[PDB]
Amino acid sequence: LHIRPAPSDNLPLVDLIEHPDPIFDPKEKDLNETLLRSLLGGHYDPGFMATSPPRRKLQMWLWSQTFCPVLYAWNDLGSRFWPRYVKVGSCFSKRSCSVPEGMVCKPSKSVHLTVLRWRCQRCGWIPIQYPIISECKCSC
Amino acid sequence: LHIRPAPSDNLPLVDLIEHPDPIFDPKEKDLNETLLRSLLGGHYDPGFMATSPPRRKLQMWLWSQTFCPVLYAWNDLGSRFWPRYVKVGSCFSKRSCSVPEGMVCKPSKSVHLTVLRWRCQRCGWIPIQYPIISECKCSC
Amino acid sequence: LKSSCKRHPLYVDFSDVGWNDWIVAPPGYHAFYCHGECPFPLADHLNSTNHAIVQTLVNSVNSKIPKACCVPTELSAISMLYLDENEKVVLKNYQDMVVEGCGCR
Amino acid sequence: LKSSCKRHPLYVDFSDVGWNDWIVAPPGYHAFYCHGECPFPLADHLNSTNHAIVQTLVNSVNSKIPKACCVPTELSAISMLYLDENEKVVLKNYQDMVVEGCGCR
């Protein structure tokens, strides 16, 4: 039952907290991009990653995809992630997407990317799922 | 500051609670419709009362008034009120009023009617404001 | 009263609180109230927030941190006849007046 | 601690609660917690519901009725790296984790 907290499918993702420390941080030797790129391999998505810093339900869908497009902005994830830079998506909650004005653009469908994570107790890289946005819904 | 509870402009109106009792109830003699009608007088609104049981902001308005009309249903107020029957309004929260579907019809503007109320400590009729609905907004 | 978090009865008589001078009707209503313990663990039948869960575990390891509190998690409104600031006796709705459900926060 | 309803500090270390077996990161976070008295009257600076106001007055006339409780009235979320049911280490958001404000309920 209530053994532990319950997660949430809300996006985008709140920045993960981290107190850095050359110990909770990789150490160069274990940073060989050649060997890193191989450990990720097919999971590397160049369209969203960078080594260095750069019935009627159909009508709702076609509509939202027109007025609620996903906006992407490169985001730095820190040193404990590889790749270090990930293009993150967000919805355009500026002007109202409906008529009469009232609704706004909200995420409706996510997509899981796989990237490397540096974890310690001793220490090493591991793969994790990083969710990003692929569709925005015009909801309220 | 927080001396007492704070009211609310939300409509329609929750039925007022009352434990009846021939004592908290008028007594015929003080029921002469001839004298009652005179005590109310100009406040009597026949369109809503019955002696016996029967820029862009403009666009939002014209729209809501078209798809969010006020629906009226006669409502019995009991014996401690005069007149006893009052046409109450409500919004059509059945089908969605916006596109893409998401918003619904919600009240946006009220109107105060004046009717008689039988109150005791000794006992007599008094006038009170009874709010009704006159406009519905297509909001969410 | 060591039972778990649940709703308890409670009728409020306005004249007993000195509100009959501005509230014309009703003479009072059933407001209820929440009470009971928020224990470790929080059973399935308990409405609780992630923080209440987190805080409850902390209380199990450190008694210095208090347990989550049993408060209303669902309320309803009531209409009231009363005299306003302008000296007119009005009839309006009052939200968050009647406790409908209890939970741990 | 007889102060009024306010937010207090509280860092939760997952390993101290036995959560470091499923939570990969972070090692813990600042959850805070609410505490303090909800007195009569409830000052301007106190977020309170109509029922809390009603219940507070009842407590002033009848000590058998408890005062309103000081609980979180505003919370925020945090992301967490953890292992899911399918054995995949996922990164998701967790709502109602950090107490942002306190009030009387």
Numbering used by the authors:
A (entry chain A), B (entry chain A): 31 to 84, 142 to 208, 214 to 232
C (entry chain B), D (entry chain B): 10 to 114
Q: What text does the study give?
A:
pmcBone morphogenetic proteins (BMPs) are multifunctional cytokines belonging to the transforming growth factor-β (TGF-β) superfamily. BMP signaling occurs through binding to and subsequent oligomerization of two type I and two type II serine-threonine kinase receptors in the cell membrane, to form a heterohexameric complex. Finally, both Smad-dependent and Smad-independent signaling pathways are upregulated and downregulated by various cellular effectors, such as coreceptors and secreted antagonists. Thus, the former are membrane-bound proteins, known as auxiliary accessory receptors or coreceptors, which fine-tune signaling by promoting or inhibiting the interaction of BMP ligands to their authentic receptors, whereas the latter (e.g., Noggin and Gremlin) bind to BMP receptor recognition sites, hence physically preventing binding.
Crystals of the complex belong to the P6122 space group and allowed the structure to be solved at a resolution of 3.1 Å by using X-ray diffraction. Thus, Noggin covers around one-third of BMP-2 residues (i.e. 74 out of 228) and interacts through four large hydrophobic patches, 22 hydrogen bonds, and 2 ionic bonds in total. Finally, the overall structure reveals that Noggin masks both type 1 and 2 receptor-binding sites. Thus, the core of Noggin interacts with the type 2 receptor-binding site, while its N-terminal segment inserts into the type 1 receptor-binding site. The structure of the antagonist Noggin bound to BMP-2 reveals that the binding interface can be divided into three contact regions. Thus, a short hydrophobic segment (P35, A36, P37) of Noggin occupies the type 1 receptor-binding site of BMP-2, which consists of a large concave hydrophobic pocket. At the level of the type 2 receptor-binding interface, a concave hydrophobic structural element of Noggin, made up of six hydrophobic side chains (L43, L46, I47, I220, Y222, P223), interacts with two short convex hydrophobic segments of BMP-2 (i.e. V33 to P36 and V98 to L100). Finally, the third contact region involves a segment of BMP-2, which is located between the type 1 and type 2 receptor-binding sites. In this region of the BMP-2 structure, the N102 residue seems to play a key role in stabilizing the complex because it is involved in four hydrogen bonds (i.e. three with the amide side-chain group and one with the backbone carbonyl) with Noggin. Moreover, residues from 84 to 141, which are part of the dimerization interface, and residues from 209 to 213, which form a loop connecting strands β3 and β4, are not defined in our structure, probably as a result of their high flexibility.
